[PDB]
Design a protein around this ligand. Structure first.
Ligand SMILES: Nc1nc2c(ncn2[C@@H]2O[C@H](COP(=O)(O)OP(=O)(O)OP(=O)(O)O)[C@@H](O)[C@H]2O)c(=O)[nH]1
Ligand SMILES: [Mg+2]
Lengths: 163, 142, 415, 13, 570, 585
């Protein structure tokens, strides 16, 4: 059992990830205004995953899900150099809170398809992940349309469940 | 357009609200308190209607429980009372010897009966058979 | 000056009705409760209402509305003092006073209404002497009813002769959010429990400051009574002269005197509390309770009532000594400690959560009230010196006393 | 009354 | 049903007629119209059980008005029972006699009343004294026709002060019901007799004989002092109504004592520890006190000027209590406790009781006008509450900040720099109109006063009367202060208030300002930018013309209304 | 965790509401604590117990996220709980309700029609304007289905999104095309209410929709001629709910058309005769039938018959029907205006009825019945009825007196006389808003102000406490003071005008606590004008202005000082701006 959230910008593949982790298929998904939850049940741990869409009118309401959360997923897109700033803004906006203070971070460098897509290292230092304190932050370069690195992030996450 | 529906007791104890109009809870607690006071301060030969603040407010007592609606001031009134009575019939249908204490208890389906009858403030099923059929099938779905 | 004193319920139907002048109509009572619904829901609540020219003096019991109606410029405190007396006399008769007490015992209660008051004029309200000719189980009225001594019948006889005193302290406290004491007065009250033979005149003396100043002992231990309110039976003209507490007591339990004084010394227990109210998240109360009072003394069964938020949830309590119960029904915590001696200082660390959605409205800040009780301990330092038993028959009674210090209004204004 | 009593003098002359 | 009840009522066995009359007054207890069975329970009245006769006396008193003609079937039974050697059954009839109000009956009952006037037992004589006033309630002139007035004056001359006090309470009743034709006042020697009778009678009798003192006024200083020295020990009694009746005459009689004597200061120092102790009572009785205390400090502010901390409300206090404590803090707002009050009132604006908060905002404002000392610190207190961003807390504050600026307009321009940005979407027109004056009057240190009124000049045609008039006031004051940037502003407000407004005073002051601007705006610097005089404050001290009358009315409704006694009775 | 009815039984044992709140917060904490446990088991019942407390009126803001979990559940009962409280705990201004948008959209594609019925229920009841924007293509898709269980629901949900988003109906113009032949009545009913809605919003939709008027003229005639069905029949009347909605659709159609109005004319002549007026149902049929006939350019034989229908309905002792009949002529006031006027005494009768609404409809229809012919006689009933109003009707009548009097006053004097009568007898009941209107019409009056201001003066010496009365007077004294005190610069033979009690009666207002301070606002305004309108005794009135410069009202402290400098420095410039105000409309 683990409360998981999938926050991040819109069109981040976060619902593409979510039915790749739960179902295993790349289903045709609308831009999700509300949320999704699918108990991804992996490495004998049922990850209760609260995928939440990243459009503008939703981002304030994110604070309502920051209670009893045990692990974060801040999906970034590697194909949006223009939005890594507000992703960095979103991250520092979100991490600086008393509610959601003890939940770990696993960053997804989604959409590795192009040379516009960065590696984890550039995105780590575009987001400034070493500026984090009391954080088990861990970037994980993932490919949603091929499932690559997703379970390995879940693998790393399964370790960090217990201590 | 039915703006809301209120079912309050002989003591005024509200057994149902259903706001088909979006007004906040303080206004919900204000307005509901007033009209219960209005209807209970109103006699038995007072035409079963109230012209309350651009709402031709429909009331129709059937038992100790009282009844309330707020229809738009362009619509029908006796049929609006018949809407109550058709809903009374559907409560009489799905329950049979429809009665006060499971209004207090099994109100959750009385909303669902209203959900099978009035959504948006208007009628979706003008038959009295087909609607209680559908709620039994969803009850048969459980 | 009453005309028609009524008793209502929480619904407003007449439990019992009794007029004394006929100058107020009996059906006027049916407007009171809607006016009571009116004035309350607009916040214009007063213990006097008015439907035209009928004035509605009322008190409120657990269920009951002792509504005394009048029309003229009646004496107001004449009414309400009688109203609490009727509650008291019914409490003297009926060990609980509710709707069952009225509707089952209308045999005696209408007779009480005939007896306690005529025309609006209370004439006989001492319940102990009233028991002798108004019974729920009739002879002539007693002479004590005729007598100026109206609290103690003659011929009262016991095997032993026991005078049981209860010098009871009640510590008021107002500490603000700043941590300063705003108002800490002490209202002490000596309540007597007399079991004596015949008609004794008891003469009491304390460590009065003024009486020691009249004696010349105004350098030793002397409590300074800022005001006392006594029983009737105390001859106050004799007390006005030379601080002389001389009286013929009634028989049984009664409060003789009610002293009040200020005190510029510390509270017996200082509380330090904190609030880590995290928005949408949680709240933390690292509250300690140090005892400033005497180490020989022990604060029995203290009950620290700290108001928590209403939607506070997931309680966690790291105490030191003493248990917490969370009371969401009062939206608070009772960190209860049974034995808490003087000099002791026990911490409690509370932790709730808070909903990630906010509530709709505000809540306000109730202070923290604790329920301490310290026996054998006069904080004001009052000391009964003697108790002169004076009987014409002449006996050696057994005067007895114990000292108990409790809270009065022990409010400490929170953050 | 679980607390116990204490006897005062009578006269205190 | 009732006939079966009347069958048991016309039974011969006692246990059937005893249970029948219990059901009748239980039917009366549940409020049934049992008046139809009136003369039938009258048959089972003259009974040997004294316990049963009270039930019929209960019924007959209740249904005397309902059956006035049928009530003639009890007169013989009363005069029968005024003679039975039990004094309990005689006075029981006597109080049943006077409360039964049928004018067909009251003429017949004066002689057994006269019989019980000169009875032996104090029990019935204190009962018969009230029945005279009950008769004088019913038929006032028959009492003087019976000449019962002097017989009541002679039970004053009786011993056992309970009978005397029941004589006095009926006397002060009848003399009230009298037109004071033959005023029933006595010498000081009877007042010496009553004051000796004071230390003996009951707590109720001690009240009623202090009420005969509410009519008397002593004529010397020592005469006033000597009686007051015997009223003085009554201030240590548990009944506050005994105490409140004692304070009422002491406030009455202190107008005769010499201030030059130390007994005047002795009386006032013996008066304050009772008055504080009255706030240690129950809150309804304290609500009696708080209206009386209000009457005291308006008359004698010297007494309780040392006590503020006891006037601090608590959380559990009733709302009528909590409002009245705030008044006395205003009535005791002095220099010595400017910091105690304003911190306490700041703790009172932190409440959810809005009207208590609304009163507390006024309590700061009445403090700011009463003392100019913390009038700076009052404003600083309020601006904190402005920065709480609670609407009614703000919406009460802006009217108050105006009135401080109306009261102390001089050096408070360091305040409006905060208050030019105060969330101008304030909705309440009493503080919207307060906003426009504060902007208008101080339209030199608010340097952007023109552009902030542009939001206030959008929905102009349907705001209010005052708010539209304040906008007509301020702009003409603004344009007279700055005619450069507000040139089109002063013309468009005349374009709306003179042309497209039907509000006639807005049309009045519109065309006046338009013609004054058209005739001579330089003279308008003398006309409307005129140095306004010091505003005469509203002295809320009740007039001593009325207040000295209300000195005689303490613990009566005239004090709890702060009205003359006739203004509310009917 | 206990069940719902176990809780209710404990709640039914509660005596004091404060004691009941103790029982609330008792269980509410366990509901909160269960929510901290993220339970899925009792999350059905804990929310259900919470919604009861919500119906009991308790702050249940916290459990709204769990409702989103119950909508996003998989068990049908948890959905059945979840869609309910979404309609209860959430509204549009709840602002957290937007998370339903994905959940509903998945559940508009759920396999079960009842789950989709729940989704169309919740969105149809309380779907937000942006949620309506985010679900618009799915509702018409579920309106393009064949499931009449959903077609009855997606139609009214489409009404809701057209109600909420008025600029969205144009994608439902293709959706509604030719489904008017539904064998089911309920779907056919919702389509009518949709076509009621579609014809309501846009006049551009009327052209496409008045074409299928004879289609439903047939189908409504099918409802009359199918005189019985085992369903839809109440008291021998077959589907009256649909029949009225067709008539209402036939009321809004043909209302300025004639060919469709004649295409519907036959069944109007039918059901005006082919109705059973015995039960309440056939009256409800015939009531809308009356209203349908009045609003369209109908056959004249319908409308003459229709007043004869209403003449029956005026005389039925059912106060329902009296409320129905009074509302009917209240509708068709202008249309067939004089066939109403012959029922005038029935309306004056209902002024003496013992119902509020009946007296309400009669008073307002009497306000509508006033032509320029009944203007003299009926007002004398109404000014009497103004005396015999309830205090709730006294405010209502006295304004409605002023409304019809400004219309059809045969005199200007008698127009003044009735208004002056009402202002004496309404007082605290006449609204302050009509006071600039009354002030305007008496300066629209140009000829009788010596007639007016004396009668104004003759009643204000009676009282001042009628505040809207003395609102009117002080402007008249300020403006037309010359017509009150005339040629009386010094003392003459005593006429009733005396130019000092004239000044005292305004001064009496200024000290009297029963002054709204716009009474005192008008009064100093009248004082300063009578520095010019009176030449008799000025500069005693300067004293009154000068002592008022220390007044406690803010503007009235402004008003006195702004006057006083003219009284002290610019005495000649006082009258230089005290010309009379212009007269506008
Ligand atoms: N080439 C490539 N495209 C991807 C990959 N992951 C996601 N995408 C694209 O990103 C788009 C967004 O994915 P979705 O999951 O459907 O949308 P979302 O990111 O969840 O945004 P919301 O629905 O608003 O929450 C998809 O349509 C994919 O085409 C990836 O790994 N490779
Ligand atoms: Mg998505």
């Amino acid at each position: 059992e683990m409360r998981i959230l999938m926050v991040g910008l819109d069109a981040a593949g976060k619902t593409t990830i979510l039915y790749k982790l739960k179902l295993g298929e790349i289903v045709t998904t609308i831009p999700t205004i509300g949320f999704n939850v699918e108990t991804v049940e992996y490495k004998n741990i049922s990850f209760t995953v609260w995928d939440v869409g990243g459009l503008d009118k939703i981002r304030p309401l994110w604070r309502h899900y920051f209670q009893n959360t045990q692990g974060l997923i801040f999906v970034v897109d590697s194909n949006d150099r223009e939005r890594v700033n507000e992703a960095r803004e979103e991250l520092m906006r979100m991490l600086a809170e008393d509610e959601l203070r003890d939940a770990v971070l696993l960053v997804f460098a989604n959409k590795q398809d192009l040379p516009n897509a960065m590696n984890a290292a550039e995105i780590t230092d575009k987001l400034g992940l070493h500026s984090l304190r009391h954080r088990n932050w861990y970037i994980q370069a993932t490919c949603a349309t091929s499932g690559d690195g997703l379970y390995e992030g879940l693998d790393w996450l399964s370790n960090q469940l217990r201590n | 357009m039915i703006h809301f529906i209120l079912l309050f007791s002989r003591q005024g104890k509200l057994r149902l609200q259903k706001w088909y109009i979006t007004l906040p809870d303080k206004e919900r607690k204000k307005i509901t308190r007033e009209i219960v006071q209005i209807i209970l301060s109103r006699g038995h030969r007072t035409s079963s209607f109230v012209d309350w603040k651009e709402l031709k407010l429909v009331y129709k007592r059937y038992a100790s429980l009282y009844f309330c609606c707020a229809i738009e001031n362009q619509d029908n009134e006796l049929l609006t009372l018949e809407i109550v009575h058709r809903y009374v019939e559907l409560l009489d249908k799905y329950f049979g010897n429809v009665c006060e204490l499971d209004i207090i208890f099994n109100f959750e389906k009385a909303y669902f009966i209203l959900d099978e009858f009035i959504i948006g403030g208007e009628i979706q099923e003008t038959s009295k058979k087909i609607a209680v059929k559908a709620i039994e099938d969803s009850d048969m779905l459980q | 000056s009453a005309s028609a004193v009524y008793v209502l319920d929480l619904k407003g139907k007449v439990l019992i009705c009794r007029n004394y002048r006929g100058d107020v109509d009996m059906s006027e009572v049916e407007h009171f409760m809607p006016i009571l619904m009116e004035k309350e829901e607009e916040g214009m609540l007063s213990p006097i209402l008015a439907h035209g020219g009928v004035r509605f003096m009322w008190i409120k019991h657990n269920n009951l509305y002792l509504v005394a109606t009048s029309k003229k410029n009646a004496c107001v405190s004449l009414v309400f003092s009688f109203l609490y007396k009727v509650v008291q006399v019914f409490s003297e008769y009926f060990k609980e006073l509710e709707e069952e007490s009225i509707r089952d015992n209308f045999v005696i209660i209408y007779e009480l209404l005939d007896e306690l008051m005529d025309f609006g004029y209370p004439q006989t309200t001492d319940s102990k002497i009233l028991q002798e000719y108004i019974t729920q189980e009739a002879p002539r009225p007693p002479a004590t009813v005729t007598n100026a001594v109206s609290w103690r019948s003659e011929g009262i006889k016991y095997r032993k002769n026991e005078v049981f005193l209860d010098v009871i302290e009640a510590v008021n406290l107002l500490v603000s959010a700043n941590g300063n004491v705003l108002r800490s007065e002490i209202v002490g009250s000596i309540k007597m429990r007399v079991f004596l033979s015949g008609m004794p005149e008891l003469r009491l003396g304390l460590n009065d400051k003024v009486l020691f100043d009249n004696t010349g002992r105004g350098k030793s231990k002397s409590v300074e009574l800022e005001d006392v309110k006594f029983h009737q039976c105390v001859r106050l003209s004799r007390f006005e002269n030379d601080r002389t507490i001389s009286f013929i007591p009634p028989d049984g339990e009664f409060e003789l005197m009610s002293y009040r004084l200020n005190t510029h010394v510390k509270p017996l227990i200082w509380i330090e509390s904190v609030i880590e109210k995290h928005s949408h998240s949680r709240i933390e109360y690292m509250v300690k309770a140090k005892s400033q009072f005497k180490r020989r003394s022990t604060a029995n069964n203290v009950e620290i009532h700290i108001p928590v938020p209403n939607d506070a949830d997931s309680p966690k309590f790291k105490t030191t000594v003493g248990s917490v119960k969370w009371v969401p029904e009062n939206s608070e915590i009772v960190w209860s400690v049974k034995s808490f001696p003087g000099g002791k200082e026990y911490l409690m660390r509370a932790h709730f959560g808070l909903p990630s959605v906010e509530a709709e409205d505000k809540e306000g800040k109730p202070p923290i009230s604790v329920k301490f009780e310290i026996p054998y301990f006069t904080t004001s330092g009052i000391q009964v010196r003697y108790l002169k038993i004076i009987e014409k028959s002449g006996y050696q009674a057994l005067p007895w006393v114990r000292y108990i210090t409790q809270n009065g209004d022990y409010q400490l204004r929170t953050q | 009354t679980s607390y116990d009593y204490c006897r005062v003098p009578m006269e205190d002359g | 049903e009732i006939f079966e009840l009347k069958a048991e009522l016309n039974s011969d066995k006692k246990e059937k007629k005893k249970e029948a009359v219990k059901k009748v007054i239980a039917s009366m207890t549940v409020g049934k119209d049992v008046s139809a069975l009136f003369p039938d329970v009258v048959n089972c009245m003259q009974t040997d059980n004294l316990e049963l006769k009270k039930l019929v006396y209960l019924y007959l008193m209740n249904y005397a008005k309902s059956q006035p003609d049928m009530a003639i079937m009890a007169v013989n039974t009363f005069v029968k029972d005024c003679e039975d050697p039990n004094p309990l059954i005689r006075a029981l009839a006597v109080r049943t006699m006077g409360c039964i109000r049928v004018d067909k009956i009251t003429e017949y009952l004066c002689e057994p009343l006269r019989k019980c006037l000169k009875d032996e037992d104090p029990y019935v004589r204190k009962t018969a004294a009230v029945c005279v006033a009950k008769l004088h309630d019913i038929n006032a002139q028959l009492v003087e026709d019976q000449g019962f007035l002097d017989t009541l004056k002679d039970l004053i001359s009786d011993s056992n002060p309970m009978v005397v006090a029941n004589a006095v309470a009926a006397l002060s009743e009848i003399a009230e019901s009298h037109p004071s034709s033959n005023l029933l006042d006595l010498n000081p020697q009877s007042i010496n007799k009553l004051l000796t009778a004071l230390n003996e009678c009951t707590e109720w009798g001690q009240i009623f004989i202090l009420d005969c003192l509410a009519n008397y006024m002593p004529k010397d200083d020592r005469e006033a002092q000597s009686i007051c020295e015997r009223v003085t020990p009554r201030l240590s009694h548990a009944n506050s109504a005994v105490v409140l009746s004692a304070v009422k005459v002491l406030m009455k009689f202190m107008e005769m004592l010499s201030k030059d004597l130390d007994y005047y200061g002795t009386l006032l120092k013996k008066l304050a520890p009772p008055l504080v102790t009255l706030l240690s009572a129950e809150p309804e009785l304290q609500y009696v006190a708080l209206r009386n205390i209000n009457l005291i400090v308006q008359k004698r502010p010297e007494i309780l000027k040392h006590e503020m901390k006891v006037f601090f409300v608590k959380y559990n206090d009733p709302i009528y209590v909590k409002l009245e404590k705030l008044d006395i803090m205003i009535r005791l707002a002095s220099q010595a406790n400017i910091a105690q009050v304003l911190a306490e009132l700041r703790e009172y604006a932190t409440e959810v009781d809005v009207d208590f908060v609304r009163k507390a905002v006024r309590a700061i404002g009445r403090c700011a006008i009463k003392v100019e000392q913390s009038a700076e610190r009052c404003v600083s207190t309020l601006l904190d509450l402005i920065q709480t961003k609670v609407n009614y807390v703000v919406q009460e504050a802006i009217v108050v900040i105006k009135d401080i600026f109306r009261k102390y307009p001089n050096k408070y321009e360091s305040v409006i720099a905060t208050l030019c940005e105060n969330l101008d979407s304030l909705d309440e027109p009493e503080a919207r109109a307060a906003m426009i004056w504060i902007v208008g009057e101080y339209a030199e240190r608010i340097d952007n006063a023109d552009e902030l009124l542009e939001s206030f000049l959008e929905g102009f045609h349907d705001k209010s009367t005052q708010v539209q008039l304040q906008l007509l006031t301020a702009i003409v004051k603004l344009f007279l202060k700055k005619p450069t940037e507000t040139q089109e502003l002063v013309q468009q407000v005349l374009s709306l208030a003179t042309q497209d407004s039907d509000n006639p005073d807005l049309r009045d002051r519109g065309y006046i300002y338009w013609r004054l601007l058209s005739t001579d705006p330089v003279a308008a610097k003398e006309v409307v930018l005129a140095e306004k005089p010091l505003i005469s404050e509203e002295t809320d001290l009740i007039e001593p013309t009325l207040l000295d009358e209300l000195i005689c009315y303490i613990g009566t409704l005239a004090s709890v209304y702060h009205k003359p006694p006739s203004a509310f009775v009917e | 965790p206990i069940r719902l009815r176990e809780l209710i039984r404990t709640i039914r044992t509660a005596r004091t509401q404060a004691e009941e709140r103790e029982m609330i917060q008792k269980e509410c904490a366990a509901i909160r604590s269960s929510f901290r446990e993220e339970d899925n088991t009792y999350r059905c019942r804990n929310v259900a117990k919470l919604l009861y407390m919500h119906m009991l009126g308790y702050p249940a803001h916290f459990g709204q996220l769990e409702c989103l979990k119950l909508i996003a559940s998989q068990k049908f009962t948890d959905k059945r709980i979840g869609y309910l409280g979404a309609m209860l705990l959430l509204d549009e201004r709840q602002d957290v309700h937007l998370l339903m948008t994905n959940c509903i959209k998945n559940d508009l594609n759920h396999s079960t029609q009842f789950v989709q019925g729940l989704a169309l229920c919740t969105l149809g009841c309380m779907g937000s304007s942006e949620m309506c924007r985010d679900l618009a293509g799915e509702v018409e898709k579920l309106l393009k289905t064949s499931n009449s269980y959903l077609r009855k629901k997606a139609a009214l949900c489409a009404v809701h999104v057209i109600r909420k988003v008025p600029e969205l109906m144009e994608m439902f113009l293709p959706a509604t095309k030719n489904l008017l032949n539904e064998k089911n009545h309920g779907v056919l009913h919702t389509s009518v209410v949709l076509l009621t809605e579609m014809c309501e919003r846009s006049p551009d939709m009327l052209a496409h929709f008045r074409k299928l008027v004879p289609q439903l003229v047939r189908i409504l005639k099918n409802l009359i001629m199918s005189g019985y069905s085992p369903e839809h029949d109440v008291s021998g009347i077959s589907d009256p709910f649909l029949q009225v909605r067709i008539l209402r659709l036939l009321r809004i159609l043909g209302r300025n058309d004639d060919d469709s109005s004649e295409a519907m004319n036959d069944i109007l002549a039918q059901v005006a005769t082919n109705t059973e007026t015995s039960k309440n149902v056939g009256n409800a049929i015939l009531y809308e039938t009356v209203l349908t006939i009045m609003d369209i350019k109908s056959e004249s034989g319908l409308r003459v018959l229709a007043i004869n229908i209403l003449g029956r309905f005026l005389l039925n002792n059912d106060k329902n029907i009296r409320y129905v009949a009074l509302t009917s002529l209240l509708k068709t006031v202008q249309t067939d205006h004089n066939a109403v006027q012959r029922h005038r005494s029935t309306i004056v009768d209902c002024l003496k009825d013992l119902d509020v609404s009946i007296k309400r409809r009669a008073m307002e229809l009497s306000f509508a019945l006033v032509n320029g012919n009944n203007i003299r006689g009926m007002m004398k009933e109404l000014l009497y009825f103004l005396d015999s109003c309830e205090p709730e009707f006294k405010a209502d009548c006295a304004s409605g007196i002023f409304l019809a009097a400004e219309k059809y006053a045969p005199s200007k004097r008698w127009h003044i006389d009735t208004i002056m009568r009402v202002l004496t007898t309404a007082g605290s009941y006449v609204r302050d808003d009509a006071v600039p209107n009354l002030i305007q019409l008496i300066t629209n009056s140009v000829e009788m102000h010596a007639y007016t201001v004396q009668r104004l003066y003759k009643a204000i010496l009676g009282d001042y406490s009628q505040q809207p009365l003395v609102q009117v007077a002080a402007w008249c004294i300020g403006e037309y003071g010359d017509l009150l005190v005339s040629g009386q610069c010094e003392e003459e033979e005593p006429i009733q005008v005396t130019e000092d009690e004239v000044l005292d009666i305004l001064e009496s207002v200024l000290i009297s606590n029963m002054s709204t301070s716009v009474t005192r606002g008008y009064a100093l305004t009248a004082i300063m004008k009578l520095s010019t309108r009176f030449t008799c005794t000025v500069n005693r009135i300067k004293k009154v202005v000068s002592i008022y410069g220390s007044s406690i009202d803010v503007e009235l402290q402004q008003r006195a000082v702004e006057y006083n400098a003219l009284f002290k420095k610019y005495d000649h410039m006082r009258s230089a701006l005290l010309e009379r105000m212009p007269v506008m409309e």
